[PDB]
Amino acid sequence: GSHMAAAESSIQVKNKGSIKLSNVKSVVNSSGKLVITSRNTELKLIDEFGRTKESYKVPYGAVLAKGDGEQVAGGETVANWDPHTMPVITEVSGFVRFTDMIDGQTITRQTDELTGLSSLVVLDSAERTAGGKDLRPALKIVDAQGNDVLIPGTDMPAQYFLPGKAIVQLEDGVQISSGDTLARIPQES
Numbered sequence: 001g002s003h004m005a006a007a008e009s010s011i012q013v014k015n016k017g018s019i020k021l022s023n024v025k026s027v028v029n030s031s032g033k034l035v036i037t038s039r040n041t042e043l044k045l046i047d048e049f050g051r052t053k054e055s056y057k058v059p060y061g062a063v064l065a066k067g068d069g070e071q072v073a074g075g076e077t078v079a080n081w082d083p084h085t086m087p088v089i090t091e092v093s094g095f096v097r098f099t100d101m102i103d104g105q106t107i108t109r110q111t112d113e114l115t116g117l118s119s120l121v122v123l124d125s126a127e128r129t130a131g132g133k134d135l136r137p138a139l140k141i142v143d144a145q146g147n148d149v150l151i152p153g154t155d156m157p158a159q160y161f162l163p164g165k166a167i168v169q170l171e172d173g174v175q176i177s178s179g180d181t182l183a184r185i186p187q188e189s
Helices: none
Strands: 010-012 017-022 026-028 034-036 042-046 052-057 077-080 085-089 094-099 107-111 118-122 138-142 159-161 181-186
Touching: none
Parallel strands: none
Antiparallel strands: 010 077, 017 042, 026 034, 042 052, 085 181, 094 138, 107 118, 138 159
């Protein structure tokens, strides 16, 4: 509903009808989630007559519960996303390969008191030592043989530099598929 705080980072369609997406670019990640890879995607609810009744802006990285044109009922949630974070998504499949990710110099491990799980977090300029000031932490994507994977149709090996405070979701050597979130960038409080 709208009584919840979650309604802020999700789209619970109001009436029954069909979903109409425009300027949408998507990809299925290894979690079987349909991920929005465009920055200008808008989601509309179309009634039985082809008329628009609802219109929403969908953020980059949001997961779509259903593809374009799918039918839906009122109250149903069709899109979900992290509102306090910004995702860095890989465009290609392969394996994650750390470069310039050094503990105490460019990254540090932060544990969640409650769940005991942990994440590597990139240190911002300040938090960085002198020796690590000039390094540029990044996630390079390589294949099974350890060779580079090029960004679709170029000579640009896929490498994703990480900004300070970014929270790493996939660590060294982990297998990934296009669409997977490599890291999440926290907001300024």
